Design a protein around this ligand. Structure first.
Ligand SMILES: CN[C@H]1C[C@@H](N)[C@H](O)[C@@H](O[C@@H]2O[C@@H](CO)[C@H](O[C@H]3O[C@@H](CN)[C@@H](O)[C@H](O)[C@@H]3N)[C@H]2O)[C@@H]1O[C@H]1O[C@H](CN)[C@@H](O)[C@H](O)[C@@H]1N
Ligand SMILES: [Cl-]
Ligand SMILES: [Cl-]
Ligand SMILES: [Cl-]
Lengths: 261, 266
């Protein structure tokens, strides 16, 4: 008895999903268990609960981003600079980890994808263009980003069996928080400009390691423990539903009270 | 979005600990987030009381304390300021030194308990109550505080357990003992100053240890533990509102050492 479309819709609504919401999804397709019609039915079920007036977004990134070329032998780097393809939002594949549904969402009609290669987001639904447009290359989790806009339209984050450590929105809280010190990274990336490949330097806060003695798992568990969000079962997966505005405010205060200057 | 609970009772915490697998006479190291458990009838001390009730007086309960105010950073200060720290900063006083800032409410509660014992190493300080509290905390060397002369080594040797109570597995102090034990291609060795009490007087000493602030290679503690649970390490169960985990110290240490050595070892 694999989970049916209807069964998942009702579990989404029991958790708190409602028509018209803008939401960002993090999922582990494995944790949900078998679904009748396969993993795409998870998305169809979710968009059914959201209705066409709602919006669904996921983090895609770019699996093949060649941001490591400086650590290669000079001779190999030269080959990358000539032969590695640029970020193409039409065909660039999503990061491997917890992303089967993101790759699925990229074949949906009317999908939008933001232009920042490393921080690329995909979205479908009413506010999909708004969320994804004019995504700055530098500080791609900052003020000119789909995360900033998700907070601004009072959207949500849904964890569908995905670990609390993987909440991309918390990088936006890192961006906002006034902290003693934040690590800056500067790395190369080929992109399309007027149809032609150009390599640029991208500047960003480091998102590979926390800027201080904390983890996102820590912050999220502290949030849930003080009453943040709702928790519930969806298929076989443990699910959480958070308000983006409230989570971001909580996380910024959390970081500023422990690591401010 | 989720309302607070009707307070958990002592009795219902004892039951939950027994259902998790806590048994009389065990020696336990506890990692807890008090808020994860939810409201408790009587406050956070009842968690400790219920756990010791599950363990009986024949059991032992240990937690990591450390020293929140350790002035181990004073070599990175300008000369004049460093001189002020050297003259004015208090020494580590086991009686009053406060535990590190996070997940330590219960460790701080443990320090007001009668018959509590505190190990002597300031940065790696452990607190314990119960039958083997003295044995576990005895003769904790100042150098290599997570090594052979540590409460963690003794916890493994007497085949104790580690109990997660809503704390991230990231924070299992025992994993620093695994780092000590593992033969790895690269290790960071640090020397830092610390004021202690010798014969009632403040004296500054230099402590030598492995760096425990950064990993010695490309890994994180969350990696190792998540890999440990994924392959069936320990038992799981609810305690109050918290998701709990119960590990055998010996098994987790062996796993984490093999984990490190297979990736970075000889
Ligand atoms: C041993 N003295 C210093 C030696 C020096 N070589 C270290 O760099 C320095 O560590 C920095 O401070 C850590 C805070 O943990 C950061 O590590 C974190 O960084 C994240 C992401 N980057 C993860 O890598 C990792 O999980 C860590 N949580 C490090 O950048 C040490 O001091 C600290 O560690 C002492 C012992 N525990 C404490 O007593 C001190 O109060 C002080 N916090
Ligand atoms: Cl997945
Ligand atoms: Cl997110
Ligand atoms: Cl705590």
């Amino acid at each position: 008895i694999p989970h049916t479309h209807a069964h998942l819709v009702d579990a989404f609504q029991a958790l708190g999903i409602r028509a018209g919401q803008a939401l960002m999804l993090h999922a582990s397709v494995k944790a949900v268990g078998a679904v009748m019609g396969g993993p795409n039915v998870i998305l169809q079920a979710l968009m059914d609960a959201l209705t066409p007036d709602g919006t669904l977004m996921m983090y895609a990134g770019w699996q093949d981003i060649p941001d490591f070329i400086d650590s290669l032998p000079d001779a190999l780097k030269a080959v990358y600079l000539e032969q590695h393809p640029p970020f193409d939002p039409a065909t660039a594949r999503a990061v491997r980890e917890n992303s089967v549904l993101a790759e699925f969402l990229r074949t949906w009609p009317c999908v939008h994808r933001s232009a920042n290669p490393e921080a690329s987001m995909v979205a479908v639904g009413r506010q999909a263009a708004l969320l994804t447009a004019n995504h700055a290359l530098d500080y791609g989790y900052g003020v000119e980003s789909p995360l900033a806009k998700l907070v601004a339209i009072e959207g949500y984050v849904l964890m569908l069996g995905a670990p609390l450590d993987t909440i991309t929105l918390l990088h936006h809280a890192e961006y906002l928080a006034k902290m003693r010190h934040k690590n800056v990274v500067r790395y190369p990336c080929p992109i399309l400009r007027d149809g032609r490949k150009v390599w640029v330097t991208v500047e960003d806060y480091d998102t590979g390691d926390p800027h201080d003695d904390y983890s996102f798992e820590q912050i999220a568990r502290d949030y849930v423990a003080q009453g943040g969000g709702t928790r519930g079962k969806v298929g076989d997966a443990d699910a959480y539903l958070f308000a983006a505005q409230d989570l971001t405010r909580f996380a910024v205060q959390w970081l500023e009270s422990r690591f401010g200057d």
